Ligand binder design. Structure first.
Ligand SMILES: O=c1ccn([C@@H]2O[C@H](COP(=O)(O)OP(=O)(O)OP(=O)(O)O)[C@@H](O)[C@H]2O)c(=O)[nH]1
Ligand SMILES: O=c1ccn([C@@H]2O[C@H](COP(=O)(O)OP(=O)(O)OP(=O)(O)O)[C@@H](O)[C@H]2O)c(=O)[nH]1
Ligand SMILES: [Mg+2]
Ligand SMILES: [Mg+2]
Length: 291
């Protein structure tokens, strides 16, 4: 007998009241690591927060701050939408120099290299951050030199190319929060805590559902479903809409550029539907049946 209205209202809160301070500190310290690097301080590099701290969708106190370190002067362009359309400092050298800069500022005990990002955990600066090296990415929509959208590009150690759209994610999230009178991100956080709750209780359908996927999914739900004074009704509306529309959908991420499903993603629609069914059952009272 969970009071789901009061539970979702509680779970709609930020991870803490000091999120902005944690994110500011992470960003400042990563910039300081760059500035103290002889090689990197001479480069056109942007350091910025992304992820749930930047978007105010974080719910875990122990979430690492996501920091992007972007070398703006290396460009990778996607020409796939335009019929017929087609340096000395490399991404690999950049990533190695970034690893060295982070080890120099925070110590080797505070830095590990993953496939995509560096894990920085340095009690001395109170920094817990996932620091990803990126370059400028572009998606062309016409053959003219100016006809592109700008984002970031990641080149993992294991190969391949990842396009990200952090500024577009942030702006569209802000706009939807405005259009819903702040209910959008409240419900994102409520649903992220619901997922974490189910995963901690051993529900296997909740385990392959990542935070960013849920943020994208809730963004997809039309604004009308966020109205009213019942957070429980909002959450139910989200589950209902998503479950009944996902099969025929061709949805994008919150940036409205990248497709939410496909071979470029680690999640699929079947996982999402199974999680939605689990969440729908768990939220009900006095259910006598189980499948
Ligand atoms: O599969 C992914 C994962 C991550 N990302 C991009 O990297 C950002 C940081 O990756 P995170 O996994 O940390 O997601 P998050 O910050 O939104 O959620 P929590 O930490 O609160 O769990 C994400 O918000 C997303 O923008 C993707 O584009 N695709
Ligand atoms: O698309 C992505 C994916 C990941 N990331 C960023 O890379 C961080 C680690 O991303 P992963 O957890 O996927 O690294 P791994 O392959 O070693 O496992 C994530 O926490 C996020 O900060 C992006 O910025 N964009
Ligand atoms: Mg994060
Ligand atoms: Mg992260």
């Amino acid at each position: 007998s969970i009071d789901w209205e009061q539970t979702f209202r509680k779970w709609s809160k930020p991870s803490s009241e000091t999120e902005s301070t944690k994110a500011e500190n992470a960003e400042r310290m990563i910039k300081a690591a760059i500035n103290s690097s002889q090689i990197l301080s001479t480069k056109d590099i942007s350091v910025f927060p992304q992820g749930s701290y930047r978007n105010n969708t974080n719910v875990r106190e122990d979430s690492d701050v996501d920091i992007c370190v972007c070398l703006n002067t290396l460009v990778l362009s996607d020409y796939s939408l335009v019929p017929g359309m087609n340096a000395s400092y490399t991404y690999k050298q950049f990533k190695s120099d970034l690893e060295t800069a982070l080890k120099n500022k925070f110590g080797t005990l505070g830095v590990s290299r993953g496939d995509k990002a560096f894990d920085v955990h340095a009690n001395s600066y109170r920094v817990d951050a996932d620091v990803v090296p990126a370059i400028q990415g572009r998606l062309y929509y016409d053959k003219n030199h100016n006809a592109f959208i700008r984002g970031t590009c990641i080149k993992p150690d294991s190969g391949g190319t990842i396009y990200n759209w952090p500024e577009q994610n942030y702006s569209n999230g802000v706009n939807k929060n405005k259009s819903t009178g702040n209910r959008f991100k409240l419900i994102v956080r409520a649903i992220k805590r619901l997922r974490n709750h189910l995963a901690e209780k051993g529900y296997n359908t909740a385990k392959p559902i990542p935070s960013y996927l849920m943020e994208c999914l809730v963004y997809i739900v039309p604004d009308q479903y966020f109205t009213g004074d019942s957070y429980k009704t909002n959450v139910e509306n989200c589950i209902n809409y998503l479950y009944n529309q996902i099969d025929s959908s061709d949805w994008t991420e919150i940036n409205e550029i990248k497709y939410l499903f496909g071979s470029h993603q680690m999640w699929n629609k079947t996982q999402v539907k199974e999680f939605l069914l689990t969440a729908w059952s768990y939220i009900q009272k006095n259910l006598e049946h189980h499948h």
